[PDB]
Design a protein around this ligand. Sequence first.
Ligand SMILES: [Zn+2]
Ligand SMILES: [Zn+2]
Lengths: 141, 242, 191, 97, 385
Amino acid sequence: MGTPPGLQTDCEALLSRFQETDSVRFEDFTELWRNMKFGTIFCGRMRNLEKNMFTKEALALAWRYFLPPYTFQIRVGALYLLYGLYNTQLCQPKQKIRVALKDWDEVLKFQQDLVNAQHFDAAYIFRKLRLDRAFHFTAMP
Amino acid sequence: MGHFMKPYFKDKVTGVGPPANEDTREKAAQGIKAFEELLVTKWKNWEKALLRKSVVSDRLQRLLQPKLLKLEYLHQKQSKVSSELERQALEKQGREAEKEIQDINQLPEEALLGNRLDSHDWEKISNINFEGSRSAEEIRKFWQNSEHPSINKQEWSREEEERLQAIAAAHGHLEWQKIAEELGTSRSAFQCLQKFQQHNKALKRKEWTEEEDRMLTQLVQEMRVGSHIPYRRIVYYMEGRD
Amino acid sequence: KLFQASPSVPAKYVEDKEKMLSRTMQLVELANETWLVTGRHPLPVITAATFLAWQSLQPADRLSCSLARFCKLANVDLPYPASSRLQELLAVLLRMAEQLAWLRVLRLDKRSVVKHIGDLLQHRQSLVRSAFRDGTAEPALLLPPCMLKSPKRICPVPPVSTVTGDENISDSEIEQYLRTPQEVRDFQRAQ
Amino acid sequence: GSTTTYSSFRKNYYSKPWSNKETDMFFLAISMVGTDFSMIGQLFPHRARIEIKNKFKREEKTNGWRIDKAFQEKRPFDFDFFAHLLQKVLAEEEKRK
Amino acid sequence: CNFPEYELPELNTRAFHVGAFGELWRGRLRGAGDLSLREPPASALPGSQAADSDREDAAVARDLDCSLEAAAELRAVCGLDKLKCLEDGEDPEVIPENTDLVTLGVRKRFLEHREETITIDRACRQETFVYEMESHAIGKKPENSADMIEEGELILSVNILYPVIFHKHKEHKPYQTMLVLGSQKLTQLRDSIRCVSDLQIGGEFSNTPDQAPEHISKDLYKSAFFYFEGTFYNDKRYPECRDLSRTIIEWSESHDRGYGKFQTARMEDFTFNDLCIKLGFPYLYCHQGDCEHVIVITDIRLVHHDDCLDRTLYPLLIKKHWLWTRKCFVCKMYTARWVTNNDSFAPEDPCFFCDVCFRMLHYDSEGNKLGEFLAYPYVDPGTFN
Ligand SMILES: [Zn+2]
Ligand SMILES: [Zn+2]
């Protein structure tokens, strides 16, 4: 279906308010995540199909902000958003982030960029999403 | 992207597809029907009004056109004959036609309709008045069995219902034309069978039987996935369901 | 090119030539006696008649077509007056259509009248004499369109007259037609 | 390329209609210049002399009284002011529209 | 290049070769193990990472080019306690009031108006079939080693549109979605299709209704073919198969009918890896000479350990569309097994009859024909869907 109901505003508000902190640390993002309690989104009487397809579309939506042309800090915030969405989901199995072949090499280069920036929270969280194998190797997101 | 809907090939100048193949021709020879034959559309009210209009026009034309042919042939003969008495006799026949056109035009619609089984031009009606949108025999069935005013269109009375249910057994719930005729209310066999089966306890079920349970279990085990089954498509195999 | 099948015309457009030419005769004969032929370019009459005859032979198949859509299949370039002739002839044939009650009952119009010309052509000589208001030996006016629009007044006697041409002439009118030297200089500057 | 080719009278090609304000300038020209259709064709570069004659032929059918009234309401003649009045009034007409 | 990209945004893609596309994935994944079908470790709260630290800290230090203590710091820092606003055990059936989400407010507006005796129920969400397809197959592994997906295999998703087009709606589509493997051939997809057109039967049997034909169309004809990138792929494994591609070409290329030049291959010639194809672009499959199916490739991807790995279930059905049954005209509640024409009893022609209704109306106690009519057996595509 595309962008889920009311999710776009919550995601962009979180990302913009994180960007306005002028900070990249996962800690700031987590304080913000926990004040507004974003992890609660996966409750609210979603039966299994709705839950899975909502997780899929939420991850695909956050992917667009993790991708360019967004800058370093906003992409880092979107990576934390992907992280929160994937690890607070209630699906079984854990539904995946759809990553395009046109995106995979650029995103690995972004891992190297996160490493080079000495800004290692985002790099660890990306490697950890890889360990969870959250990213999925689909032709299109 | 929706332009590729069936047929996936459609010619750009005339819209036609490829010609008939060997397999389709052999299937038609064997009489195997195509799924496009299953498409049937509902009779909307203006369709029925147009049908009545077409039937009355057909009857009016069948009446008048021979009369006007007589009139015009008489006039043509009159325009060339020189004998005065023969001229006046031909004029008298022309006056016959002139009177008759006025009288028949003064006929009312029901008299034009006449009897349920009278001759009507289904072909011309279908391809000209209905432009072929509905076929000749489809129109024929619809009119002669449901739409002509002589058909009993009334609601079923309690006495009619009870006598239907009683006399249905006398024929074994078979041969429903005989049941309809014995009912005496000018019902059709289809009407009587429809009314019977919408209430017959033998068809619509609150009950269960061993073969229905067996095949329900078999189809459920065959086709269910998790929580889903095709509830109302299992009906085709176990009888009396909905 | 209507007489054989071709990739441009499948069979539903194909037709027998004999029927068409006959039908066109039965129409053109009406055109002349209804004053439509006289004083016009003749060819538009033929085009209109052929277009409608071809339609009416299979109206269920052919009612959906149009002037140019029909002609470009035959690679024919059409008259623009053919539209005028078409409107004229439909106007005529509906007036024939009302003459017969068993045609009157259908409440015929532009869309529907086409598929009955086969019916009308059998009795057209009766239709015209039942339709014209000019029942004289020598309800609808059987006249050319040039006065079917009707005169605003029926040509009263013209005012044939003379005047006195010998009077004196007002010199003021003459001097009004002359430029002053100031205007002469203005035109010289403009030139 | 076909033998069906139509031939009909093409000498009535689409000419540009006349504006109401353009007509007003035409009348003030009769007031201001006269009936020298060649000269008027020069004051209206967008109209040629035959257009002026056709304009006069159309106007004379009903508006002879206005023709005379303009002709008697004489004004001193200037080509330059005339051209400025034209394009300014045309631009004003477009801006209003 | 075989580099995916949109031709129309979110509607269709530019063409690429499937095998090279798979190798372009594996050139970025082979050896890394992210494409493997083997269970990796996962996250947890920072309080129970001690056992996994010995295995994780060294690898994190290697990949992030940091020290072991930096890896441990990042691991405890990025723990899930910083994100789990929901405790491990809270049910999803209720909206947590401790939230500021606009999404959960909109969800509140969705749920609260249903809390009335007229609307209280646990019925379908929007559609039924998809999660049933997932739950019965997801995460499973085969009982036979020969039915086990190869690691890094391409997984394709194909929509097979029904021949019965809605013809009142063109936005949403009638189809069933099918997963196929890159290494597999077109033969297997064609064999797996359960379409009702194979079950087509006919013949006029008003005089002897019990002499219904012994052969379905599948037993009489076996022709079928896919069509991609201008190439037909026709089956010729059986004598009942005919290469329909020849006749199609012989008429289509006779005129500028608006389509390009085509070529002919067999069905068994190609694996799904051999194709050069677009995603979302309408393609064609046909069988029984007349049942054309619109083919849309809606997804293609590598396999992963969470996927259905049991190939006995492959080709895997994942979505379907719910056609309605053709209920008889007599009782209007029951699906027809017969259809009649020229019927003197029926009010219309054609008229559809269930087996029982057909038999009582048209026959006496001994099955003798009554009245004037023609009859044909009927298999319902709205039932056998
Ligand atoms: Zn099929
Ligand atoms: Zn029934």
